[PDB]
Amino acid sequence: VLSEGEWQLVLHVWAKVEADVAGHGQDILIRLFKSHPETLEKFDRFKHLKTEAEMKASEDLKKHGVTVLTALGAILKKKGHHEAELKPLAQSHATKHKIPIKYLEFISEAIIHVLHSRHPGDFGADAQGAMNKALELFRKDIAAKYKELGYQG
Ligand code: HEM
């Protein structure tokens, strides 16, 4: 359970991300695909991309980064009361997209890295710890839905 002070740190940096949702979404997906190439293989939509320059040039990838970050921002702004938002996301990611929880840990690392690069003054260690707690809570709740459905592993 995050404290109110922890949530304020999370949402303070997130309000900065929202100034350039698409730039952040590109940086995060590119970091994820470069750091963990098994993740790119889950996207029939993107698996033709073979270089970072091709990734940066793809408008469709930039569009999907906005989709992703808009869904994450709506979950963070619920401050833990996010059951309605996680149901469809866990369902699609477990049963249609076939995304292991571990890959959610990988995109969490990529989000934290990109927030640290772009917002260092609002992403000191206190805010890094709070964002890690928020993303851990996200993963915990999704993993419980995966387990229900027979996909936790
Ligand atoms: C912060 C974590 C994530 C969020 C908020 C998120 C959100 C979304 C949303 C909103 C969609 C479109 C609606 C839907 O299908 O449910 C989507 C699609 C998808 N996501 Fe995620 N996602 C996350 C992580 C991941 C990861 C880590 C992977 C793969 C390693 C992944 C793979 C996919 C795939 C394959 C699609 C379908 C893309 C397409 O062909 O249109 N997602 N995601």
UniProtKB/Swiss-Prot annotation:
The modification Phosphoserine is found at residue 3. It is an enzyme of class 1 (oxidoreductase). Heme b binds at residue 93. GO terms for biological process: removal of superoxide radicals. Monomeric. It comes from Physeter macrocephalus (Sperm whale). This is Myoglobin. Its EC number is 1.7.-.-, 1.11.1.-. The lineage of its organism: Eukaryota, Metazoa, Chordata, Craniata, Vertebrata. O2 binds at residue 64. It catalyses: Fe(III)-heme b-[protein] + nitric oxide + H2O = Fe(II)-heme b-[protein] + nitrite + 2 H(+); H2O2 + AH2 = A + 2 H2O. Its main location: cytoplasm. GO terms for molecular function: heme binding; metal ion binding; nitrite reductase activity; oxygen binding; oxygen carrier activity; peroxidase activity. Monomeric heme protein which primary function is to store oxygen and facilitate its diffusion within muscle tissues. Reversibly binds oxygen through a pentacoordinated heme iron and enables its timely and efficient release as needed during periods of heightened demand. Depending on the oxidative conditions of tissues and cells, and in addition to its ability to bind oxygen, it also has a nitrite reductase activity whereby it regulates the production of bioactive nitric oxide. Belongs to the globin family. It is found in: Cytoplasm, Sarcoplasm. Keywords: Cytoplasm, Heme, Iron, Metal-binding, Muscle protein, Oxidoreductase, Oxygen transport, Phosphoprotein, Transport. Gene3D superfamilies: 6.10.140.2100, 6.10.140.2110. The modification Phosphothreonine is found at residue 67.
